[PDB]
């Protein structure tokens, strides 16, 4: 399809200010404000009752939104949302304003949580789909991201290769942003990921972030959960979602890394649900 080609960038052959950083590597705390239309697949999961941000998410077609399972279901914290508890807001930039004539607000038809999502232990298979009640109209600000094929995943999911994380979550581990935030972060070697934590890491996870000695900073944080870790393919110039913001111990701590759901590894399940 037309996935992963942004109306305000690839479609008009304009580059955003940091995408070159990603390309140069293919050999939110400490982020920046997103540019307008920089992440047109970004979705905000929005609670109705206390009207508040619940999580990030992504648009993968006109009717399907991808997020982290723990955004919807986490029994240890008495979290178990139903379809009616929330809305998805699409095309947003500002965190708090209603963006008249730009954002579109959709209701959920059905939530699907991965049947082997491990909320009991380590958040293994931290992935969920939301089918919308009505298709959303694409615009300059609303456009789906691609899901990776095996070859794009193998070629790009390499240590040192950078992807990009976006969200409206905390700027610090212990303020909130006026607009959507963005940070580019390098994928980390699996042994370094494993050695940074006591949590049992699985093949359905990867980690990203700079090492203490590399100097540069940045991480996702509370409120960024469920949002996309994306990479711009140097083969076809399309953006692909490789990860979902899952977990981390604090935010932007030296020696710690952000963990992300490995989208490709779970793609058979995604397709199973969408095929219905």
């Amino acid at each position: 399809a037309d996935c992963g080609l942004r109306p305000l960038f690839e479609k008009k052959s304009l580059e955003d200010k940091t995408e070159r950083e990603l390309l140069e590597s293919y050999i939110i705390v400490e982020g920046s404000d997103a540019e307008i239309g920089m992440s047109p697949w970004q979705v905000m999961l929005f609670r109705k009752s206390p009207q508040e941000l619940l999580c990030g998410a992504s648009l993968i077609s006109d009717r399907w939104v991808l997020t982290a399972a723990h955004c919807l279901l986490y029994p240890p914290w008495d979290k178990n949302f139903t379809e009616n508890d929330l809305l998805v807001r699409i095309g947003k930039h500002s965190r708090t304003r209603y963006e008249r004539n730009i954002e579109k607000i959709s209701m959920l038809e059905k939530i699907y949580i991965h049947p082997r999502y491990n909320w009991r232990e380590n958040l293994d298979r931290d992935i969920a789909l939301m089918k919308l009640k009505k298709p959303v109209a694409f615009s300059d600000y609303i456009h789906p991201v691609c899901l990776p094929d095996r070859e794009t995943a193998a070629s790009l999911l390499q240590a040192g290769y950078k992807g990009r994380v976006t969200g409206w979550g905390n700027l610090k581990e212990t303020g909130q942003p006026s607009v959507l935030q963005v940070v580019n972060l390098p994928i980390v070697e699996r042994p370094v990921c494993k050695d940074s934590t006591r949590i049992r890491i699985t093949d359905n996870m990867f980690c990203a972030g700079y090492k203490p000695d590399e100097g540069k900073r940045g991480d996702a944080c509370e409120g960024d959960s469920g949002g996309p870790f994306v990479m711009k393919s140097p083969f076809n110039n399309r953006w692909y979602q490789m990860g979902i913001v899952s977990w981390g111990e604090g935010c932007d701590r030296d020696g710690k890394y952000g963990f992300y759901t490995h989208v490709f590894r779970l793609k058979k399940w995604i397709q199973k649900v969408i095929d219905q």
């Binding site: 941000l53 809305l87 708090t96």
Partner: peptide
């Protein structure tokens, strides 16, 4: 501190 969204969105 979220702006009220249109009531039509339930």
């Amino acid at each position: 501190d979220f702006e009220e969204i249109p009531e039509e969105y339930l």
